Every structure is written in structure tokens, then in C-alpha cells.
């Protein structure tokens, strides 16, 4: 029981990544190689002219992706879970991740007992194509977030990336933390995420191959695609 997850986790750890594929809950996973970068995705896109706020950086544009997808399908080192402080699961992407990873994910989460807002903890990925899950707890906005809550949201992304770094992982996908059940406005969240990932990549670009913005609703897809050229200029 309380070593079930331990055994499975350690077991999957030894498998080659195409041995792992047989164990994935899905057969339609998305390999990282097939996820295009922002440098590629920006070819042919009309950037409406603006007062510039960032320098174009080819190399940083190679390390961020925006993708509309179910995040459980991404074959990356880690997907980030928009969790609750109890790590019990829930009806948003937390529920998709728990169902796709399996009941053994729940058992590891029980040993981690809680997660504070703006903080993060890592578990194994189990049946998920992703090797690990980084669980973080966003602020609960109730429509109109406070400045301290804008800081908590930024802090979920930084604590998540800090854990990536400590565990020497190089690919991660993020869902739109706090914007579902926790009610953060989608526009204000994306401004914070994009500013945060740019500055983080300025300082740590050598340590990762890809940060992925995994959006789920068209609304966030539209929001992010329109703000990406401001934070990651291409011309």
C-alpha cells in the first residue's frame, strides 16, 4: 500500500523512454520533438506594431512553446498541476492529471501532506507520459486579485521552475494556473506568466530545453498568442 507508489516510481525510473511508452495511459502522446517552438510558430504571424518592451532573442524563442492541448498527453520531464492545498485532486486539470496518472499518484500525494499557496512539490508521473508532476497551489482570486495575489501566482511558476532546476529536469509544461476554479482573470494571469517566464529564461536558459504554455480553452490560446510577441519579440 504505502510502498506501492514507491515500487512503481522506482520501476518506471529504470525503463528506457520507449519502454515507458508501453506503460502510458494514452497511445496518442505528444513527443517534445513534435512540439514547435515560438521561433518556428512565429513564422508567418502578423505582429501588430507596438512600443517595444523586450529585446528579440532568438535563443529564448527556441526554448518556449505555446500549445493548445490536454496537458496529460505531453511527453515531457514534468507537467505542472494546478493543485489544492490538500493535494486531494479536483475538478480542473488536477482531476485530469489524477485520472490519467492513476491511483498511485494519490498515494504519493498523501505522503506529501499539503502544499502552501505559491509553493510547489514534486511526485512521480505514474501512467502519465510525463516523468514527474510538479504540484503547486495558485491564489484563489474570486474575480479581482490583489497585488499580493499577483505575487502568489508568479510564485507558483517560480517555485515550479526552482523544483525543475533542483531535480535537473529540462522540459516542463504549465496549465493556466488559478484561472479555472480559482477564478483568476485570464488576461491578467497571462501577463504575469509571460513576464515571469521571460525573466526566468533570461537567467536560466541554459538549464532547460523547453518551457511549454499548455492552454486548454481557445480563450487562453487567443490571449497568449496575442501577448507572446510583446514578451518574446521576433522582429
Ligand X SMILES: Nc1ncnc2c1ncn2[C@@H]1O[C@H](COP(=O)(O)OP(=O)(O)OC[C@H]2O[C@H](O)[C@H](O)[C@@H]2O)[C@@H](O)[C@H]1O
Positive or negative torsion for Cα 36, 77, 138, 178: positive
Q: To 10 degrees, what angle do helices 186-204 and 218-231 make?
A: 40
Q: Which is nearer to ligand X, 90 or 102 (CB)?
A: 90
The owner of cell 496549465 is 175
Q: Is 178 annotated as a binding residue?
A: yes
Nearest distance from C-beta of residue 1 to ligand X, angstroms? 23
Least Å distance between CB 187 and ligand X?
12
Q: Which is nearer to ligand X, 80 or 161 (CB)?
A: 80
- What is the closest distance, in whole angstroms, from the C-beta atom of residue 206 to ligand X in the complex? 28
First to last CA, the chain: 55
How far lies 35's CA from each of 43, 78, 80, 99, in Å? 15, 15, 17, 24
Distance CA 15, CA 165 (A): 22
Establish whether 102 is an annotated binding residue: no
Alpha carbon distance 131, 24 (integer Å): 10
Contacting positions for ligand X (CB under 6 A): 70-72, 82-84, 89-96, 138, 175-182, 214, 216-217, 220
Answer yes or no: are the C-beta atoms of 75 and 81 closer than 8 Å: no
91 carries a ligand binding annotation: yes
Quick one: 42 or 176, whose CB is closer to ligand X? 176
Q: Which three cell numbers stand for residue 180?
A: 479555472
Q: Least distance (Å) from ligand X to the CB of residue 3?
A: 26
Nearest distance in Å: CB 85, ligand X:
8
Instruction: Give 47 or 112: the residue with its C-beta nearer to ligand X.
Output: 112
Tell me if 118 is assigned to a ligand binding site: no
Ligand-binding annotation for 10, yes or no, is no
Between 82 and 104, whose beta carbon lies closer to ligand X? 82
What is the secondary structure of 101-154 as a DSSP string?
H-HHHHHHHHHS----BT-EEEEE-TTSSSSEEEEEB----TTS--HHHHHHHH
Question: Is residue 84 marked as binding?
Answer: yes
Binding residues: 69-71, 82-84, 89-94, 177-183, 216
Binding residues for substrate: 69-71, 82-84, 89-94, 177-183, 216
Amino acid at each position: 500500500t504505502s510502498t506501492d507508489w514507491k515500487e512503481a516510481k522506482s520501476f518506471l525510473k529504470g525503463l528506457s523512454d520507449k519502454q515507458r511508452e508501453e506503460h502510458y495511459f494514452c497511445k496518442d502522446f505528444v513527443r517534445l520533438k513534435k512540439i514547435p517552438t515560438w521561433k518556428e510558430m512565429a513564422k508567418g504571424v502578423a505582429v501588430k506594431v507596438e512600443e517595444p518592451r523586450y529585446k528579440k532573442d532568438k535563443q529564448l524563442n527556441e526554448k518556449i512553446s505555446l500549445l493548445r492541448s490536454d496537458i496529460t498527453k505531453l511527453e515531457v520531464d514534468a507537467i505542472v498541476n494546478a493543485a489544492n492545498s490538500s493535494l486531494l485532486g479536483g475538478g480542473g486539470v488536477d482531476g485530469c492529471i489524477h485520472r490519467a496518472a492513476g491511483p498511485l499518484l494519490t498515494d504519493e500525494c498523501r505522503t506529501l501532506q499539503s502544499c502552501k499557496t505559491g509553493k510547489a512539490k514534486i511526485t512521480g508521473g505514474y501512467r502519465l507520459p510525463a516523468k514527474y508532476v510538479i504540484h503547486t497551489v495558485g491564489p484563489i482570486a474570486y474575480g479581482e486579485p490583489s497585488a499580493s495575489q499577483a505575487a502568489e501566482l508568479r510564485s507558483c511558476y517560480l517555485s515550479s521552475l526552482d523544483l525543475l532546476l533542483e531535480h535537473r529536469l529540462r522540459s516542463v509544461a504549465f496549465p493556466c494556473i488559478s484561472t479555472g476554479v480559482f477564478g483568476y482573470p485570464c488576461e491578467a494571469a497571462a501577463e504575469i506568466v509571460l513576464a515571469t517566464l521571460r525573466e526566468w529564461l533570461e537567467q536560466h536558459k541554459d538549464k532547460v530545453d523547453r518551457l511549454i504554455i499548455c492552454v486548454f480553452l481557445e480563450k487562453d490560446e487567443d490571449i497568449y498568442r496575442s501577448r507572446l510577441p510583446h514578451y518574446f519579440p521576433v522582429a
